[PDB]
Swiss-Prot record, chain A:
<keyword id="KW-1015">Disulfide bond</keyword>
<dbReference type="GO" id="GO:0019081">
    <property type="term" value="P:viral translation"/>
</dbReference>
<feature type="binding site">
    <location>
        <begin position="324"/>
        <end position="325"/>
    </location>
    <ligand>
        <name>substrate</name>
    </ligand>
</feature>
<feature type="binding site">
    <location>
        <position position="456"/>
    </location>
    <ligand>
        <name>chloride</name>
    </ligand>
</feature>
<keyword id="KW-0597">Phosphoprotein</keyword>
<dbReference type="GO" id="GO:0003051">
    <property type="term" value="P:angiotensin-mediated drinking behavior"/>
</dbReference>
<comment type="function">
    <text>Essential counter-regulatory carboxypeptidase of the renin-angiotensin hormone system that is a critical regulator of blood volume, systemic vascular resistance, and thus cardiovascular homeostasis. Converts angiotensin I to angiotensin 1-9, a nine-amino acid peptide with anti-hypertrophic effects in cardiomyocytes, and angiotensin II to angiotensin 1-7, which then acts as a beneficial vasodilator and anti-proliferation agent, counterbalancing the actions of the vasoconstrictor angiotensin II.</text>
</comment>
<dbReference type="GO" id="GO:0008237">
    <property type="term" value="F:metallopeptidase activity"/>
</dbReference>
<dbReference type="GO" id="GO:0000122">
    <property type="term" value="P:negative regulation of transcription by RNA polymerase II"/>
</dbReference>
Curated annotation (Swiss-Prot), chain B:
<comment type="function">
    <text>Attaches the virion to the cell membrane by interacting with host receptor, initiating the infection. The major receptor is host ACE2. When S2/S2' has been cleaved, binding to the receptor triggers direct fusion at the cell membrane. When S2/S2' has not been cleaved, binding to the receptor results in internalization of the virus by endocytosis using host TFRC and GRM2 and leading to fusion of the virion membrane with the host endosomal membrane. Alternatively, may use NRP1/NRP2 and integrin as entry receptors.</text>
</comment>
<protein>
    <recommendedName>
        <fullName>Spike protein S1</fullName>
    </recommendedName>
</protein>
<feature type="region of interest" description="Receptor-binding motif; binding to human ACE2">
    <location>
        <begin position="1"/>
        <end position="69"/>
    </location>
</feature>
<feature type="region of interest" description="Disordered">
    <location>
        <begin position="16"/>
        <end position="51"/>
    </location>
</feature>
<feature type="disulfide bond">
    <location>
        <begin position="41"/>
        <end position="49"/>
    </location>
</feature>
<feature type="region of interest" description="Disordered">
    <location>
        <begin position="80"/>
        <end position="97"/>
    </location>
</feature>
<comment type="subunit">
    <text>Binds to host ACE2. RBD also interacts with the N-linked glycan on 'Asn-90' of ACE2. Cleavage of S generates a polybasic C-terminal sequence on S1 that binds to host Neuropilin-1 (NRP1) and Neuropilin-2 (NRP2) receptors. Interacts with host integrin alpha-5/beta-1 (ITGA5:ITGB1) and with ACE2 in complex with integrin alpha-5/beta-1 (ITGA5:ITGB1). May interact via cytoplasmic c-terminus with M protein. May interact (via N-terminus) with host bilirubin and biliverdin, thereby preventing antibody binding to the SARS-CoV-2 spike NTD via an allosteric mechanism.</text>
</comment>
<feature type="region of interest" description="Immunodominant HLA epitope recognized by the CD8+; called NF9 peptide">
    <location>
        <begin position="9"/>
        <end position="17"/>
    </location>
</feature>
């Protein structure tokens, strides 16, 4: 008679029907990604529309069960996602044009290309590969500047419509703006004291970034000092670095600059590529050695169907498969991974990452279909990264025999390793905080359409310290060409991931009683840390992420302390080398303004 | 390796909803629509009216834990009727003198 009995009955039946159609929808996308055929492209759209329209039909009966009469926390969370109508709240004209803009911006990004000024290569892989190893000033500027001319300027009217259509959806959902929609993933309500406001994330990412500045300023001055001798006129000691020299198009990762930034070139570097050649290992034993890593910590092994259905290579051009590593979770215990596995040092750490998502999905797999998910968008990739961090340590490499036991491990070897991770990690946080905060300000309405590029480069010199060689007007749009913004994917998950992975790295090493620096820690063979982590992995989003985080690290929010401690050995070395230079940068310097 | 086939097998169903719990050794084949609330159903699907029988997805691609198992349950009951079924016997060699 009560609403709770009627709501639970709807959820018990919905979990079965939604799980059956989601498996066929994910299976149709699997056959299309592994094999390109005319039959699979139609099955992906057919099975994809059946699952998409299924949530739209069940959303009508979901809004008929108010959450005010339900005293259960697990029931209200299962009805929280079903209460939203998605795009049904938009008008018929705006709903149909919404999928058109998303498909048009995704097509232009895939079909976009920059023809050689001297002699036409597509961006991915073509332009993304050249910009990595290019040391030329003009060659990098030609591909960086001419791209946004036919893309950033062309996607501007499509980006303006993208802002208007998505703002009307948040207004019908009783959200302040569309920037608050992505902040609703961290929303926590229903528990006394653990409630987390949506507007709190704005103050959280801003406060944690303040303590990141002293660590980032020393690294930004270290990279600038190495590239200062090349172009002393364009690169000022108190100025900023050019945008096209960051190592790739958008400057997401600085790993491409690790070649020239090596502190000591007279010492060898740790590489498992040449070691796997003499051992003669194939793609079959790479996942097998990584499966034993999950057994040493107490986590269950992989099912027989997982290793049998794995795709280990690309059989030529007859049957083409996407080589981008991705962990696909279909359902009902069906776990598969599509990756092209060669013999490299990076594929070894990638195998622990791709298997980390599958191992993460095994803990909460006992939960209903509505309760199967990460607690947030940052916990998905963070679980796979902490598995790879323990594998990259010299202690784990000497255990299985990749690295020689007589290899000398000292400060000179470890500082070289911490710098490579810093270019990927430390360089990501200011860039992710910059672009995400810019989207929140434009979607809110604080920045007029004419000041989009005016505030973009102005706030860029303040955060990441990057100035444009060629000034741009309001016609260009930098985020429009980005992969995540154009494809409507969460850009905030990259900033919080760094803070979540380092908290878990410090907590697991304290449970196993590891001593010394944190980068020397290895979680292998230690079953004590796997038991404390397994309790949170099986919770998913059925429990508040603030409550599940306290059960591991004892903290109710994000904290910079594990970020500083793990980078502390590198921070002390960068401070001594930057004494001869100026720590920090100025926002009043420009390459074309003298 | 037998029941599961490519495309799914919808022949095997199960009763998801019932107003109460079944008694021991009871079989209910009734297809009557389950009524969750007080809303009338009358055999028509709708609000608070759900079709109880649901389908088992069967394909070889599913995980090992969820693979369907054929279960044969033997019910052993001793009544006052004369006993007939007994265990197997054993015959030995015959010797004389």
């Amino acid at each position: 008679s009560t609403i709770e009995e009627q709501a639970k009955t709807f959820l018990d039946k919905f979990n079965h029907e939604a799980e059956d159609l989601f498996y066929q929808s994910s299976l149709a996308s699997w056959n299309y990604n592994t094999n390109i055929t005319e039959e699979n492209v139609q099955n992906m759209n057919n099975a994809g529309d059946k699952w998409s329209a299924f949530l739209k039909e069940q959303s009508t009966l979901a809004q008929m069960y108010p959450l005010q009469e339900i005293q259960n926390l697990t029931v209200k969370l299962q009805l929280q996602a079903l209460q939203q109508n998605g795009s049904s709240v938009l008008s018929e004209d705006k709903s149909k044009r919404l999928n058109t803009i998303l498909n048009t911006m995704s097509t232009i990004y895939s079909t976009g290309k920059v023809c050689n000024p001297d002699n036409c290569l597509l961006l991915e892989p073509g332009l993304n590969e050249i910009m990595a190893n290019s040391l030329d000033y003009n060659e990098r500027l030609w591909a960086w500047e001419s791209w946004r001319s036919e893309v950033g300027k062309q996607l501007r009217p499509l980006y303006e419509e993208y802002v208007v259509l998505k703002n009307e959806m948040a207004r019908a959902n009783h959200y302040e703006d569309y920037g608050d929609y992505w902040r609703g993933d961290y929303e926590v309500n229903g528990v006394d004291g653990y409630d987390y406001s949506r507007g709190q994330l704005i103050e959280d990412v801003e406060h944690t970034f303040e303590e990141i500045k002293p660590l980032y300023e020393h690294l930004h001055a270290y990279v600038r000092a190495k590239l200062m001798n090349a172009y002393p006129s364009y690169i000022s000691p108190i100025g900023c670095l050019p945008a096209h020299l960051l190592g790739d198009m958008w400057g997401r990762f600085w790993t491409n600059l690790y070649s020239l930034t090596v502190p000591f070139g007279q010492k060898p570097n740790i590489d498992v590529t040449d070691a796997m050649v003499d051992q003669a290992w194939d793609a079959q034993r790479i996942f097998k050695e990584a499966e034993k890593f999950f057994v040493s910590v107490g986590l269950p092994n992989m099912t027989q169907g997982f290793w049998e259905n794995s795709m280990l290579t690309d059989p030529g051009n007859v049957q083409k498969a996407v080589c981008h590593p991705t962990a696909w979770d279909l359902g009902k215990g069906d776990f598969r991974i599509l990756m092209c596995t060669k013999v490299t040092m990076d594929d070894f750490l990638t195998a622990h990452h791709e298997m980390g998502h599958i191992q993460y999905d095994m803990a909460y797999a006992a939960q209903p279909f509505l309760l199967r998910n990460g607690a947030n968008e940052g916990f998905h990739e963070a679980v796979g990264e902490i598995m790879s961090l323990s594998a990259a340590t010299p202690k784990h490499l000497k255990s299985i025999g990749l690295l020689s036991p007589d290899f000398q491990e000292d400060n000179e070897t470890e500082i070289n390793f911490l710098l490579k991770q810093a270019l990927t990690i430390v360089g990501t946080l200011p860039f992710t905080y910059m672009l995400e905060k810019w989207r929140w300000m434009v979607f809110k309405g604080e920045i007029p359409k004419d000041q989009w590029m005016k505030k973009w480069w102005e706030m860029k010199r303040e955060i990441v310290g990057v100035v444009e060689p060629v000034p741009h007007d309001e016609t260009y749009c930098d985020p429009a060409s980005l992969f995540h913004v154009s494809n409507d994917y969460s850009f905030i998950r990259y900033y919080t991931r760094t803070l979540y992975q380092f908290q878990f790295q410090e907590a697991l090493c304290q449970a196993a009683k590891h001593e010394g620096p944190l980068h020397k820690c290895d979680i292998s063979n230690s079953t004590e840390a796997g038991q404390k982590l397994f309790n949170m992995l099986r919770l998913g989003k059925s429990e508040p992420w603030t409550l599940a985080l306290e059960n591991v690290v004892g903290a109710k929010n994000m904290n910079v302390r594990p970020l500083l401690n793990y980078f502390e050995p590198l921070f002390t070395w960068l401070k001594d080398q930057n004494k001869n230079s100026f720590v920090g940068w100025s926002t009043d310097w420009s390459p074309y303004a003298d | 390796n037998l029941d599961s086939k490519v495309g799914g097998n919808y022949n095997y169903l199960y009763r998801l909803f019932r107003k109460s719990n079944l008694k021991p050794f009871e079989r209910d084949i009734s297809t009557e629509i389950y009524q969750a609330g007080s809303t009338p159903c009358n055999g028509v699907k709708g609000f608070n009216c759900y079709f109880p029988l649901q389908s088992y997805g069967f394909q070889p691609t599913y995980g090992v834990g969820y693979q369907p198992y054929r279960v044969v349950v033997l019910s052993f009951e001793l009544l006052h009727a004369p006993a007939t079924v007994c265990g197997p016997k054993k015959s030995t060699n015959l010797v004389k003198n």
